Ligand binder design. Structure first.
Ligand SMILES: CC(=O)N[C@@H](Cc1cc(F)cc(F)c1)[C@H](O)[C@H]1CO[C@@H](OCC(C)(C)C)[C@H](C)N1
Length: 389
């Protein structure tokens, strides 16, 4: 472990998002910022909102620069409108550097800020191609690398607790690590396996095979990447294209058929509860996602447990029961490897070598019988044909 200053610098959870502490302006204004690999805009609340306890005050920053331009970002459900500008930015539990970066000062928003989340802004870590208004708005990570000696790489260890946490427990507990400029070897076990970044827009990857308890889903691999497959810390669930979702749910139901669950559970709408400590993890199957490797005709696999895809939630009666929602859902915008997936792994965003590394997380939730896995190599032909165009 050679990045001690950055270890344990995250807080939060899969459902409301993981955040890092940052400061903006002169003198520094402290804000909690959502770490999002599924967007490319750095934005902060800059006007009072019922869910914000603090916000960026441009008139109190002597280093604030007005870009005199409007900006709008529509997300999956939420959205915001704001005003573009620049300021000095630092990450207290990050590299010991200050950079001048673009900041969208949020003036209006709908279903963006989450009550009790503890975050007041969003750090879009993806590439300029998906930045709004357009690709001329340099994302924060690009500015950081260009202005400093920080290597063009970041890595994320998201730590799911495996049980519910209220707002107060979230504040008090460590939610993970964001290592800026390096790979901290204390955050994972086993080997790091790398998948290519197909195109620099979202963090786009190629899934070449899917298994449920070792049983091949047997779909044309193009289906798994229709119309794209992305790694997104800003999305909670594992989201699958409609056809893949229907086939995966049918297979997960058949594997867990010793117990019957209502349709609302499988639709990700209603919770299922079990008496304290009796969740039957063993009846639920493991899920393997095979990803294209860096060597020609070579693949590797990442394997998750129900401890990853069953999201802990507090009971409607707040009882001693262990309650969960099914964290797999349909998508009409391709595969999304969200926070519940990422929680099983140490993920290295190697922008310099246009590749994503995965290793078993030192903080993944498991039992005495099974663990999450990263294994290879596998001989896999015609992998570039799995890519949708
Ligand atoms: C749940 C969701 O919308 N997730 C958000 C973050 C976010 C987290 C949050 F807690 C509250 C939010 F309102 C927003 C991700 O950025 C998504 C947005 O859509 C896609 O990106 C589209 C754009 C590039 C932004 C135009 C891609 C799947 N990444």
């Amino acid at each position: 472990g050679s990045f001690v200053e950055m270890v344990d610098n995250l807080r939060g959870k899969s459902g409301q998002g993981y955040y890092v502490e940052m400061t903006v302006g002169s003198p520094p204004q402290t804000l909690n910022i959502l770490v999002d690999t599924g967007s490319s805009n750095f934005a902060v609340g800059a006007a009072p909102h019922p869910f914000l306890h603090r916000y960026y005050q441009r008139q109190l920053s002597s280093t604030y620069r007005d870009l005199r331009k409007g900006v709008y970002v529509p997300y999956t459900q939420g959205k915001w409108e704001g005003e573009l500008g620049t300021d000095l930015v630092s990450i207290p539990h990050g590299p010991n550097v200050t950079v001048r970066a673009n900041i969208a000062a949020i003036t209006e928003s709908d279903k963006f800020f989450i009550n009790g989340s503890n975050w007041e802004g969003i750090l879009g870590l993806a590439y300029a191609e998906i930045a709004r208004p357009d690709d001329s708005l340099e994302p924060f990570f690009d500015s950081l690398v260009k202005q400093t000696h920080v290597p063009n790489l970041f890595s994320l260890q998201l730590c799911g607790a495996g049980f519910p946490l209220n707002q107060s427990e979230v504040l008090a507990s460590v939610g993970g690590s964001m290592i800026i400029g390096g790979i901290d070897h204390s955050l994972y076990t086993g080997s790091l396996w790398y998948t290519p970044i197909r195109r620099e827009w979202y963090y786009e990857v190629i899934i070449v095979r899917v298994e449920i308890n070792g049983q091949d889903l047997k779909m044309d691999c193009k289906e798994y990447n229709y119309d794209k497959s992305i790694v997104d810390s800003g999305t909670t669930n594992l989201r699958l294209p409609k056809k893949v979702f229907e086939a995966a749910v049918k297979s997960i139901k058949a594997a867990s058929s010793t117990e019957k669950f209502p349709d609302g559970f499988w639709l990700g709408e209603q919770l299922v509860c079990w008496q304290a400590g009796t969740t039957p993890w063993n009846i639920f199957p493991v899920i393997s996602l095979y990803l294209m490797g860096e060597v020609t005709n070579q693949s590797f696999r990442i394997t998750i447990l129900p401890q990853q895809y069953l999201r802990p939630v507090e009971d409607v009666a707040t009882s001693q029961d262990d309650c969960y929602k099914f964290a797999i859902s349909q998508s009409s915008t391709g595969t999304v490897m969200g926070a519940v997936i990422m929680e099983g792994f140490y993920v290295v965003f190697d922008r310099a070598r246009k590749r994503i590394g995965f290793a078993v997380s030192a903080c993944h939730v498991h039992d005495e019988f099974r663990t999450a896995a990263v294994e290879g190599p596998f001989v896999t032909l015609d992998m570039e044909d799995c890519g949708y165009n």
